[PDB]
Amino acid sequence: VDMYIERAGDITWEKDAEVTGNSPRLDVALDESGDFSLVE
Amino acid sequence: TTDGVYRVMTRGSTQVGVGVMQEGVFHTMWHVTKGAALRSGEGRLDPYWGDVKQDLVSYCGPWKLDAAWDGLSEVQLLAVPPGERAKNIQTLPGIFKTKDGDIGAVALDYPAGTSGSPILDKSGRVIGLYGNGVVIGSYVSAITQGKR
């Protein structure tokens, strides 16, 4: 299986960016497999 | 080798993720490549460091990205979705609260092949990578940053 990379852009902040999304505060645990789960 | 954001492709061809070239090191998420070597032109990039718990891997050298969210300011996801031009999405992160401290998180839901896309602070520095997270039915990604 050939995995390969292609350049897609510069790493730059864009002044004209779409703004969206919430800012939830969540309790989580991170297990040994790198999986986040919610906690209560 | 050139600095930038990159698609990670497999073989028809499919985009399985994204990563960041900086200071001669390619940075992406473990779940994207599982550490496999990557072709870049006629060259090969070999893994150098990886960690399943952090869900991160670096190629050609140690992890170089060390900026962190300031906890107050909006950030931008430099999303590189499959089949789409790199685009910036600005957002105020929420927070993953964990026993070992708080982590920024972005409540943005892009296709799986966007995993590894960089999240940027206002100065243009990569503060982490997108694509390891939790579901609340909306996905929320940690801002995953390694250690330099």
Closest residue in chain A to residue B37, using alpha carbons only? A3
Q: Give, in words, the CATH class of B4-59.
A: mainly beta
What is the spatial distance between Cα B110 and Cα B117, in angstroms, rounded to a whole number? 10
Q: Rounded to whole angstroms, what are the CA distances from B39 to B7, B33, B60, B118, B134?
A: 12, 12, 12, 20, 31
Q: Rounded to whole angstroms, what are the CA distances from A37 to A9, A26, B46, B59?
A: 33, 10, 31, 28
A40 contact residues in B (CB cutoff 8 A): none
Q: In DSSP terms, which residues pair with B139 in a beta bridge?
A: B135
The answer to whether the Cβ–Cβ distance between A1 and B10 falls below 8 Å is yes
- Point out residues after which chain A has a gap (C–N over 2.5 Å): none
Q: Give, in words, the CATH class of B75-142.
A: mainly beta
Q: In DSSP terms, which residues pair with A36 in a beta bridge?
A: A30
Experimental method: X-ray
Which part of chain B is CATH 2.40.10.10?
75-142
